[PDB]
Amino acid sequence: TLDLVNLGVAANFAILSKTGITDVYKSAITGDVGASPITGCAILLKCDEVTGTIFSVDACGPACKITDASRLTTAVGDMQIAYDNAAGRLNPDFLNLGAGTIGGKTLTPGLYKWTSTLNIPTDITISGSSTDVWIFQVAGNLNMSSAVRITLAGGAQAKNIFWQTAGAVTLGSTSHFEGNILSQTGINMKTAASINGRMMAQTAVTLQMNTVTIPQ
């Protein structure tokens, strides 16, 4: 029933930011990474940290980098269209579920909105079919605590989950996240946190020894 958020060319990236990608070595990224319009030197990943292509707007950046301004321009533009599309969905199924703390919940499909910061202090399940869609609209920050795991149940797929945040995302140390993040600012991961999803930030993505896998 709820339509997918079309990511266009941004679908090809595990990490896409506008002001760079910082990293505490070593991270494990599966899929392409990019930043635009910032210089490629703002991508602080080593070549042995990415399975995929590192894209740069210029001659600057990691040894393996491909320079491709035009593809990054399209990807970032596509990321902004996706952000606006996700932020623009009307008629939420839920508004202010758990008063902004959703620890222990099982989330069924649909459109969710929070006019605050969303916190996830304890494990949650996202439960639905291989074709169901979840859009989470968050007017503040999104926080997940250390060791918190998002579990998928019933055939729910990470590629059908979208998190739209007006504020910064903070994934706590050793936490496991599921879904696409469309952040208006930063996405900040802590020591050994993992994500099955895409990190699309209109500022920066920051990593500390993270595992990042594009959804299949």
Numbering used by the authors: 61 to 276
Task: Copy text from the publication.
Among these mutants, only FfIBP_CC1 and FfIBP_CC4 formed disulfide bonds within the intended area. However, FfIBP_CC1 did not exhibit any significant difference. Moreover, MD simulations using the FfIBP_CC1 structure indicated that the disulfide bond formation between C101 and C120 stabilized the fluctuation of residues in the capping head region. Consistent with our hypothesis, FfIBP_CC1, which has an additional disulfide bond on the capping head region, exhibited increased thermal stability, with a melting temperature (Tm) of 65 °C compared with wildtype FfIBP (60 °C). The TH activity of FfIBP_CC1 was akin to that of wild-type FfIBP at equivalent concentrations. Interestingly, unlike wildtype, FfIBP_CC1 underwent a two-step denaturation.
This disulfide bond increases the overall rigidity of the protein and reduces residual movement at the ice-binding site, thereby augmenting TH activity and protein stability.
